[PDB]
């Protein structure tokens, strides 16, 4: 469902889901943050409807511009936290 | 062997965060923002958030004292790190304040400390952790008594945070965070670094000086004007290295009867040597051993002689370092600056504008500052000022804040020893203080 | 009586101790400050006990370290017990004839720092100047203070000799000591990590010229 | 435009190399090691090799004076750069020495200077370039008279280099590289930078102070011990900024008859003002204007008064800056530090060990050093030394090298005023000098 | 004759030939310096036999280990000079 070009630089992302300490982990690369969102919906269909945002911690930063690339948003090898809204 | 790192000073002031080099995290396969499990001495563990630091050595980990305490380790010790992938959002945690940090605090602990501290921060905690929360011009310590997913979890927005009354006693090995550390010293980067070098081997690896016959420094003379933080440095170096600290106050010694002075000097060195590794700090050395001519007494000259003798009577001496503070080199007797004595000097100068800023942050850590408060500006208008001046400034600012609110409080009755958490010190308070 | 003169750290104590050991004589140290630290009366009692014990164990050397602490320029004393101590010293020395064969050595910074009555005729009538060492001397001192260290091949003591003109023996000994402790610190991070041999591996450790440079600029 | 850059000081000491920022070369599409064509003032061009420099501003190009001269521009001016893809390996070049740089030189020129300078280096050259070759304790300048592919080429291993006879005269606009420049000053980075700021607008953009009513500095007091290079700095700043330079030597003035002193001060300021923009340098100011009490003469007091008057008599002054050197601030009359006068002070201190090294390289540029010569070492054994000491050291070293070879040379006859190019100064020469 | 993966980072190299001011410029990427040699022989067949070396100037550095990558040998966007031997 997520397509990874094996010849491009790649990275892992760890998602902390609100819904319990659900820890999902996934290879991405020059994907957008919006790709993390679709991966999340893909892995937890129930969230398709639910309203949530993605952020990093320490400090809290809301990933507001989902069109940015993991590289641009400095999210290589990062933990992304799902916050309900 | 790759997961073992050397403990180093924090740059990130958040007690939850430890820092690794970019390369090291690569090597260990750790996510930026990951929860990590630290293993220390005496079978202690801590859980923390890991972040990268560009200036951190590849073999070092940066952590605040809070975490060093929890792991029962000190700067230069060795811990092990490992990811914590299983860590769950906690259902409920139970925390209690340490008694000695909450005397006089008649507030709502949850509402005033815990709620803001944990709110949306995603802090990991482990049972038996002591953490620190600042606020209301005080810093309270709490112990984690229970976590629902035991023994560690993340305090998520849905985690129920319980106190449930009755401050607890401080155990023996649990050092107060109110103790002086390098964290409480601003604007001495260079000199603090020298002193740390001098003292490292003698205080942290004393067994060495039984194995070899090289002489470490014995006496260190800290020089500079009053209020520059010489006492602070000595106290901090002791605490951080886990050495015993013995204060000798010049005036206190000189206040004694002829003979009870010399007896007090002796008891100081004896007690040091008994509890080594140890630091003896001689505050206001010029009160005891002034310029050879400035003494007029005969018992006065006996006291100085007694001090020289005691210095000479220190070989490795179970590993005792003597530190002493004075205004200027030439204020004291040139014989203490002899060889087997105060043969090392360090100048604690007036702080620069950067240093002034560090000092101002140190002395405001527990205050609520309004958004209009600059600090870098206060730094810039205080050129002559030394640490003690800046601390007084913050203190005067805060007391002015309190007076302004005191008429208002007396009228709609007198919450008094409480609303000090809602109170904020404003730039107007600092200006008031800056012109006094 | 032999008066050894020169700046601190020139090895006056060392000379006296060595001469005693080498000649098989008994050695008795009197430290100026130690004597002056005592109660009025316990000073004079300590001087007396020193000469008595020397004479009892002769042939013997009494070394008086920091003579100017006990017998400073006649005017520099203000006390009355202070003047009694100096007098007590004159008495004891003049009371040593051929004695049981007891020689008295004393160290001070300068001739003029002490009471001229001590540079008397039956007392400190021989003076010897222990000056600042030259570059050759500096080298001997550096070898003495390295005898038990392992030096890397790149260590040139003659070089260290040349950049230490002002230095006296005590300075050079401190230099070697600082060099060695730096060597140890460099290896200490490495050792803590792959566990802490600690009070060992100090034999495999070598002090490098880089260690001396570090020390030479401190 | 992107091809326009601001001229800046060289880091790379090789006269063929100019430096750009990494980003700028990217932007301009220039290859590391590319031959580039520089365009300056007065329709002049230069060809150089371009390299990247990490510390170079994106809008600046770093070049040595040699190339600045060839382009008739000064630090801060604007040049244009462009790639030179058509540049050919030259068939033959013709070079001649400038007369004033080759007085006394009785050598091969080709074998001693040109051959080693060009050998396998792939230097680009342009007709009408003056370049500099160092060696034999001299630095010789040559002019490029003809290149076979005209007007520029690369001197490749097969390029025939002609220098057939007859040193040429120096044209008017061709400044000697023997003139003092910033490249002749070591260990003053910080202070030299301040002085350059102060002087930039008044000396390089004088028309400004006719367009506005803001006051530039008038008097700059350089202090520090003798031999620290104060005269050097003032001379260099003049040369580099293209300002007129007028020296007033304290002792020279005071050596004159009462009245011919005051007449000489006056003529100095008049001539400066006439030739502005200009720098007046007052060497040994304390000889002329000592502490108000230290003067005993009556003509002496008249001279200091005359100096104050002359300072005050400098308004917009066209654009005249007065620089003066003295040992200490307190050695001179305080009225000189009044506001309209010597209101700017700069401390030229003792150099550090890094500075000492720069000075040692500066004073060895024209010597052949043996491989065993370690300047960093000589740096470390010369802690007290100031520039003038280090220059003397190199001079003593070189003269010792020459004496060692002089017995050998007298015997197998006396090449003498030659063979100084084959001679190499050895570390043994420096040790000899270091202990004298 | 030289193959460039246009999906991979790429660079241009200017080769200063000894055989006169021959300025050849060619694109490459993670090619080895030995690929520059191959390209040189390809472009000047006559030199298949001739003995030569590759170097940079200022300072002169002989590119002795031809197995190194343009990236490793810090030769991105560089001028390489052919020196006869
Ligand atoms: N460098 C400093 N950093 C932080 N606080 C300082 C510093 N210097 C002084 N202070 C503050 O002022 C107080 C007085 O300093 P103290 O240690 O008594 O210095 P000194 O012994 O030089 O007088 C300190 O306890 C501290 O609160
Ligand atoms: N000439 C010397 N040779 C070797 N070591 C010396 C010499 N001079 C001084 N030292 C060192 O300095 C130390 C302190 O000197 P010390 O014996 O107290 O001399 P002084 O009594 O003149 O100060 C000595 O124990 C020794 O280690
Ligand atoms: N910073 C320096 N860099 C290079 N050479 C220096 C430096 N300082 C001094 N020198 C050398 O020593 C000589 C003495 O310096 P001088 O200009 O007379 O200084 P001052 O005017 O302070 O006495 C100079 O002409 C120069 O050759």
């Amino acid at each position: 469902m997520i397509l990874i070009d094996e010849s491009e630089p790649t990275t892992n992302i760890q998602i902390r889901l609100a819904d319990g300490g659900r820890l999902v982990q996934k290879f991405n690369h020059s994907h957008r943050i919006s790709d993390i969102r679709l991966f999340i919906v893909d892995a937890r269909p129930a969230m398709a409807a639910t309203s949530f945002i993605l952020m990093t911690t320490f400090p809290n930063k809301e990933l507001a511009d989902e069109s940015q690339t993991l590289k641009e948003a400095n999210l290589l090898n990062a933990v992304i936290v799902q916050r309900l809204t | 062997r790759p997961n073992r790192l050397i403990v180093d000073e924090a740059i990130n002031e958040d007690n939850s965060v430890v820092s690794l080099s970019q390369p090291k995290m690569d090597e260990l396969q750790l996510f930026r923002g990951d929860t990590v499990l630290l293993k220390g001495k005496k079978r202690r563990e801590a859980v923390c958030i890991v972040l990268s630091d560009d200036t951190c050595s590849d073999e070092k980990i940066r952590m605040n004292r809070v975490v060093r305490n929890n792991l029962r380790v000190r700067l230069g010790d060795v811990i092990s790190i490992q990811p914590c992938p299983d860590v769950k959002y906690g259902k409920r945690i139970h925390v209690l304040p340490i008694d000695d940090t909450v005397e006089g605090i008649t507030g709502n602990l949850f509402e005033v400390y815990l709620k803001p501290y944990f709110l949306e921060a995603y802090r990991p905690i482990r049972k038996g952790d002591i953490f620190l929360v600042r606020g209301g011009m005080r810093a309270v310590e709490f112990k984690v008594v229970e976590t629902d997913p035991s023994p560690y979890c993340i305090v998520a927005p849905d985690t129920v945070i319980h106190c449930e009354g009755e401050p607890i006693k401080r155990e023996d090995e649990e050092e107060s965070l109110n103790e002086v550390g390098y964290d409480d010293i601003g604007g001495c980067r260079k000199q603090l670094a020298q002193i740390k070098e001098m003292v490292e081997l003698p205080l942290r690896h004393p067994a060495l000086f039984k194995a070899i016959g090289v002489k470490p420094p014995r006496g260190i003379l800290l020089y500079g004007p009053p209020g520059t933080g010489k006492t602070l440095i000595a106290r901090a170096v002791a605490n951080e290295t886990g050495a015993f600290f013995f204060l000798i106050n010049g005036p206190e010694i000189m206040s004694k009867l002829a003979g009870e002075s010399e007896s007090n000097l002796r008891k100081a060195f004896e007690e040091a040597a008994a509890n080594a590794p140890a630091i003896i700090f001689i505050d206001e050395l010029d009160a005891i051993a002034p310029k050879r001519e400035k003494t007029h007494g005969e018992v006065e000259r006996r006291i100085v002689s007694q001090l020289l003798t005691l210095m000479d009577g220190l070989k490795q001496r179970a590993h005792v370092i003597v530190m002493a503070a004075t205004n200027r080199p030439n204020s004291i007797d040139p014989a203490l600056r002899r060889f087997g004595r105060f043969d090392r000097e360090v100048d604690i100068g007036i702080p620069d504008a950067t240093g002034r800023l560090e000092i101002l942050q140190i002395h405001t850590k527990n205050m609520k500052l309004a958004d209009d408060v600059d600090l870098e500006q206060v730094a810039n208008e205080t050129h002559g000022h030394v640490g003690a001046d800046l601390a007084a400034l913050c203190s005067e600012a805060a007391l002015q804040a309190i007076r302004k609110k005191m008429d208002l409080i007396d009228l709609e009755d007198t919450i008094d020893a409480e609303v000090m958490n809602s109170l904020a010190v404003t730039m107007d308070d600092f200006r008031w203080a800056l012109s006094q």
Side-chain angles (χ1 to χ4, degrees), chain A residues 1-21 23-85, chain B residues 1-163 165-337 339-436:
Chain A
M1 297 291 103
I2 176 174
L3 171 80
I4 297 151
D5 176 351
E6 290 297 347
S7 71
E8 266 197 54
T10 59
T11 197
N12 291 73
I13 294 298
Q14 182 187 308
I15 292 92
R16 294 304 306 222
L17 288 307
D19 80 286
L23 168 124
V24 298
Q25 173 206 19
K26 193 27 82 29
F27 240 40
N28 295 258
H29 41 207
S30 152
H31 280 105
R32 291 184 174 72
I33 76 182
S34 60
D35 290 304
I36 301 152
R37 178 181 285 293
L38 40 99
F39 167 74
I40 282 160
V41 166
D42 181 31
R44 298 282 195 277
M47 244 109 70
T50 331
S51 187
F52 71 78
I53 57 89
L54 296 179
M55 47 164 35
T56 52
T57 60
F58 297 100
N60 288 5
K61 191 201 222 307
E62 212 191 294
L63 301 169
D65 181 4
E66 301 209 350
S67 84
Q68 281 184 296
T69 237
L70 299 197
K71 175 178 171 193
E72 292 166 342
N74 176 46
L75 291 176
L76 304 183
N77 234 288
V79 171
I80 310 280
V81 169
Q82 174 181 51
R83 195 169 37 104
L84 262 28
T85 189
Chain B
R1 232 51 137 220
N3 67 324
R4 272 177 120 162
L5 296 59
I6 291 158
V7 181
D8 190 348
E9 287 207 72
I11 297 282
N12 197 316
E13 284 196 348
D14 186 296
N15 292 334
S16 296
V17 167
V18 301
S19 293
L20 265 48
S21 79
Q22 197 56 84
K24 192 55 152 191
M25 275 175 93
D26 300 345
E27 175 180 343
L28 265 320
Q29 299 151 39
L30 292 167
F31 297 85
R32 173 183 328 295
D34 214 355
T35 298
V36 53
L37 175 107
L38 282 346
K39 284 216 182 111
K41 290 175 167 186
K42 303 152 74 65
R43 293 158 253 251
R44 294 281 304 181
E45 18 201 42
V47 288
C48 296
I49 298 309
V50 56
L51 264 48
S52 77
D53 171 66
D54 56 2
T55 67
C56 171
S57 177
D58 292 3
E59 277 64 40
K60 298 205 186 162
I61 177 163
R62 299 192 179 287
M63 40 174 92
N64 290 283
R65 195 149 36 116
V66 152
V67 177
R68 288 194 300 272
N69 284 5
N70 283 321
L71 292 175
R72 304 295 184 270
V73 298
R74 311 206 177 259
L75 273 348
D77 284 357
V78 154
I79 55 82
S80 76
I81 190 173
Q82 336 139 20
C84 216
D86 50 303
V87 63
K88 279 276 289 145
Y89 284 10
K91 239 268 185 201
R92 146 184 320 102
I93 61 148
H94 299 271
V95 297
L96 280 41
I98 308 279
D99 58 11
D100 65 51
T101 67
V102 291
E103 286 159 2
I105 295 281
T106 181
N108 189 257
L109 278 201
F110 329 70
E111 295 292 284
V112 163
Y113 293 96
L114 275 351
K115 268 77 196 160
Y117 176 65
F118 281 116
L119 183 75
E120 294 157 345
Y122 294 90
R123 296 175 185 293
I125 58 178
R126 159 93 157 69
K127 190 206 217 148
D129 277 1
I130 292 171
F131 59 97
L132 181 67
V133 184
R134 306 184 174 274
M137 266 127 314
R138 263 185 93 168
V140 178
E141 292 167 45
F142 299 86
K143 179 142 162 62
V144 182
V145 171
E146 202 57 272
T147 54
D148 195 6
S150 243
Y152 51 69
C153 74
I154 300 296
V155 181
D158 283 339
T159 307
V160 177
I161 171 161
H162 286 305
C163 312
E166 259 347 281
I168 73 162
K169 55 159 297 279
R170 167 176 307 287
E171 286 49 48
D172 297 286
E173 330 79 306
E174 294 178 342
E175 294 189 342
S176 180
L177 279 301
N178 182 59
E179 240 25 76
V180 178
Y182 302 146
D183 234 349
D184 312 299
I185 304 172
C188 280
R189 205 241 152 254
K190 316 141 284 315
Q191 33 271 70
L192 200 48
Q194 284 192 247
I195 292 164
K196 261 189 272 184
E197 269 191 341
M198 284 180 191
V199 144
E200 182 64 31
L201 291 193
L203 284 190
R204 298 246 68 228
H205 299 285
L208 193 77
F209 297 88
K210 249 74 168 180
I212 74 188
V214 306
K215 283 166 72 197
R218 278 288 145 260
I220 309 165
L221 246 176
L222 305 192
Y223 295 113
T228 222
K230 299 174 262 157
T231 313
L232 207 62
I233 293 170
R235 214 356 189 167
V237 170
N239 287 348
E240 289 285 19
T241 62
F244 172 82
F245 185 75
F246 200 100
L247 179 74
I248 295 172
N249 185 53
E252 146 92 10
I253 289 294
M254 294 317 248
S255 81
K256 266 13 171 309
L257 299 167
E260 194 199 352
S261 300
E262 300 91 340
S263 173
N264 280 346
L265 287 187
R266 267 180 261 111
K267 198 64 213 142
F269 287 65
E270 278 168 36
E271 200 180 339
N275 293 288
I279 292 181
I280 299 168
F281 181 58
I282 302 175
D283 191 15
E284 296 180 89
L285 178 65
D286 39 291
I288 290 188
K291 199 59 176 169
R292 46 80 182 163
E293 63 260 22
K294 295 307 155 77
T295 49
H296 63 92
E298 186 158 80
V299 26
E300 294 179 3
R301 281 180 218 106
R302 181 181 310 110
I303 279 163
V304 174
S305 275
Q306 164 69 114
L307 182 61
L308 309 171
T309 287
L310 277 171
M311 291 303 287
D312 300 345
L314 236 45
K315 308 294 69 182
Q316 318 300 19
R317 204 71 344 105
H319 329 86
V320 168
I321 291 186
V322 179
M323 279 189 258
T326 189
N327 290 7
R328 13 200 299 137
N330 46 57
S331 34
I332 64 175
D333 173 42
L336 311 138
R337 263 107 74 68
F339 275 113
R341 331 219 237 243
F342 294 104
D343 47 20
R344 302 297 324 264
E345 306 151 42
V346 173
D347 180 1
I348 313 303
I350 293 166
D352 66 352
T354 309
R356 256 149 42 237
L357 175 71
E358 297 175 46
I359 294 165
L360 262 353
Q361 302 158 346
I362 286 162
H363 292 109
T364 55
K365 302 168 314 236
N366 296 338
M367 275 179 212
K368 278 136 227 75
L369 297 179
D371 294 299
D372 72 358
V373 166
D374 187 358
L375 268 36
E376 188 156 312
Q377 183 48 37
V378 178
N380 291 322
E381 307 187 33
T382 56
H383 179 257
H385 287 39
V386 299
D389 291 310
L390 300 173
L393 197 59
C394 305
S395 219
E396 275 292 290
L399 284 174
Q400 173 74 341
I402 295 150
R403 274 189 299 281
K404 81 192 322 170
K405 255 228 330 195
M406 217 51 208
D407 296 60
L408 278 75
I409 287 174
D410 275 358
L411 266 177
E412 276 67 61
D413 183 24
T414 60
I415 323 170
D416 198 302
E418 223 207 296
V419 78
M420 275 59 246
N421 198 86
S422 56
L423 186 271
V425 179
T426 76
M427 185 65 155
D428 188 62
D429 299 318
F430 277 95
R431 310 250 30 132
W432 180 87
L434 260 315
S435 55
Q436 201 70 16

